[PDB]
């Protein structure tokens with residue numbers, strides 16, 4: 001019953017809000033999300049690594065997007081250094097999964113793909129001046145993360161681990177995939193964030209918590225992912241073709257680079273948050289990838 005505490009905080013911070021019911025519907029490792037009154041999502045976090053940007057982004061998009069695809073619309077927010085809460089009406093629907101996709105008719109699949117493409121085209125096309133502050137430079141961030149590695153645990157890594165990192169840094173230095181179009185991206189655009197209605201059409205998109213002005217290629221990273229969690233490379237390829245005017249080969253390169261980085265990102269997260277578990281997981285993942 002983290003629930004009782006959160007109920008207290010909600011009713012305390014939002015003057016006239018009454019919690020008749022509240023259950024946990026999702027949990028990150030940093031955050032917890034709650035379904036309140038079978039109607040409202042409350043996303044909450046205990047510590048500037050908070051929800052101010054995410055709020056600015058919903059507000060920018062609800063103002064500027066013209067689409068029937070629903071996104072969170074923030075009605076309640078409390079933002080402080082130690083605690084952030086965002087409340088919005090739950091988008092209703094079913095989350096896309098590989099299993100579900102595989103039961104869809106070819107036409108249903110095509111329409112879903114089209115809807116996705118169309119959403120991304122609209123969002124990426126937005127004049128982002130009003131949120132110009134929300135920029136993200138992935139290359140620079142990785143360079144800074146590498147420095148942090150060097151200043152902390154690098155020297156205690158194994159040769160195999162070092163070689164995996166250095167081989168990645170060499171690739172990062174040689175790639176051209178950061179030199180293209182920048183635009184506003186969702187930046188965590190995977191199928192556990194996509195909602196379907198009863199006709200298997202795209203009805204909503206959630207979790208713009210990593211969104212920012214970044215490489216156009218970023219929003220295809222999970223659509224191109226080949227894994228148990230995602231639909232598959234062909235799904236992303238097809239979506240890229242529908243989206244148009246984008247170098248597919250570079251999109252795939254970008255995805256492949258971000259996937260190579262994942263275990264390192266996992267390690268860095270563990271260092272930054274003082275969680276050994278993640279440091280260990282990421283190093284182990286390097287070995288699993290090395291021996292594939």
Ligand SMILES: NC[C@H]1O[C@H](O[C@H]2[C@H](O)[C@@H](O[C@H]3O[C@H](CO)[C@@H](O)[C@H](N)[C@H]3O)[C@H](N)C[C@@H]2N)[C@H](O)[C@@H](O)[C@@H]1O
Pocket residue numbers: 188189190210222225227228229230259262265
């Ligand atoms: N779990 C196993 C899988 O993990 C990654 O893919 C998943 C990402 O981790 C998720 O994103 C999360 O992690 C990111 C940093 O990695 C964060 O930025 C983001 N805020 C988080 O929601 C994303 N939404 C779905 C995607 N399938 C690897 O690519 C994949 O090979 C591996 O099989």
Ligand SMILES: Nc1nc2c(ncn2[C@@H]2O[C@H](COP(=O)(O)OP(=O)(O)NP(=O)(O)O)[C@@H](O)[C@H]2O)c(=O)[nH]1
Pocket residue numbers: 025026027028031033041043045072089090091092093192206207208209
């Ligand atoms: N049906 C539905 N579920 C939602 C909605 N918003 C959030 N959820 C559920 O709550 C979970 C957590 O939401 P999400 O924004 O992805 O937060 P997070 O990834 O756990 N936290 P963070 O983005 O800070 O890392 C989602 O995976 C989903 O299960 C919504 O509007 N509709």
Ligand SMILES: [Cl-]
Pocket residue numbers: 276279280283
């Ligand atoms: Cl370790």
Ligand SMILES: [Mg+2]
Pocket residue numbers: 193207
């Ligand atoms: Mg999420």
Ligand SMILES: [Mg+2]
Pocket residue numbers: 188207208209210
């Ligand atoms: Mg998120």
